[PDB]
Backbone:
């Protein structure tokens, strides 16, 4: 369904996710403190892992190395490439 | 150039604006309320015009039609394309 | 509400230094590294600068105590001094 939840509190995001049935359900939340600081929360097993969406000096987004111009591109790329140094897909 | 943030009491923020030498001078206001919406406060003459920063389901930012991947990109774009659909206003930094 | 804009360092510090209360502050965001922050804090006629440090878990801190967000760090230092020798508490500009 939707994956962007705006400035939803970390704890509420984890409550949402933690209840999901499937390994790979995710959301992106935006920091209330830092405009355009995004986090990706992903359910896996009994935990919910959290990845900061990094920005480079041109404002591109990335998790580790590869850069994306938009959150949508990052999400779609990580539908087939793992977000973790562990096998984590959507 | 760097961005500076601070909790100006809104009235003082508006006083600071419009006293700038350029109409295009602007600030970004961050909503106190739950969504945390963003707005642009832009000087024009002695008044301050307000532009809502709208968001879609992919997290993009926009004012009218064209969408932007960051607030920074929106600002930089409107340094060269007018922010208003009537009067020609171009965003400028605080002087 | 929070207002941010592109104020030149020198003008920002001039405005700050002119504030009536020690501890009045602004947050500066890096030009090079989006979301890299420092705190500019009035103390007398000076402006002290505290880098917002980040660790390997993404926590925010200035000295020893670590916080989960920039907001938590700032609010904590509204009631606990940012300086060890000087009693300096963050407050909004007026
Ligand atoms: N992005 C825009 O604002 C463009 C456009 N501009 C305006 O209306 C003018 C003023 C400046 C000159 C140009 C017209 N803005 C306004 O009068 C007020 C402006 C404003 C500014 C700040 C704040 C404070 C804050 O939210 O924190 C609130 C509201 C209102 C914007 C609402 C918008 C109607 C609307 C509402 C909800 C969802 C929408 C989705 C898609 C389209 C429109 C939607 C009408 N408004 C324009 O569509
Ligand atoms: N969080 C802290 O700052 C704690 C401590 N700060 C200080 O002692 C005081 C300030 C109060 C009075 C004098 C001492 N800080 C400073 O003088 C400089 C203060 C500053 C802040 C912002 C501006 C403006 C701007 O960059 O745009 C300029 C300078 C930060 C200094 C950096 C810090 C060391 C550091 C940090 C991050 C990564 C590092 C990687 C490798 C090595 C060192 C690293 C040293 N400094 C303190 O760790
Ligand atoms: N993009 C990435 O996160 C890659 C990588 N992430 C991780 O290793 C794992 C999560 C999965 C299981 C354990 C490892 N995340 C973390 O440790 C912390 C994780 C996180 C996510 C969301 C929340 C808040 C919430 O909950 O909203 C808090 C923390 C992200 C990042 C912190 C990062 C260090 C760092 C800090 C600042 C600037 C940096 C610039 C360049 C490189 C690193 C920087 C270390 N961490 C990873 O660089």
Residues:
């Amino acid at each position: 369904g939707p994956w962007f939840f705006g400035k939803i509190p970390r704890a509420k995001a984890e409550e949402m996710l933690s209840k999901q049935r499937h390994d790979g359900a995710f959301l992106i939340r935006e920091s209330e403190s830092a405009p355009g600081d995004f986090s990706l929360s992903v359910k896996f097993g009994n935990d919910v892992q959290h990845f900061k969406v990094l920005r480079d000096g041109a404002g591109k987004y990335f998790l580790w190395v590869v850069k994306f111009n938009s959150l949508n591109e990052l999400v779609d790329y990580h539908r087939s490439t793992s977000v973790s140094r562990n096998q984590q897909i959507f």
Notes: Residues 70-79 of chain C form the longest helix (10 residues). The interface with chain A takes residues 4, 29, 32-35, 37, 58, 68-71 of chain C (CB under 8 Å). The two ends of chain C are 13 Å apart (CA to CA). The first strand of chain C starts at residue 2 and ends at 5.
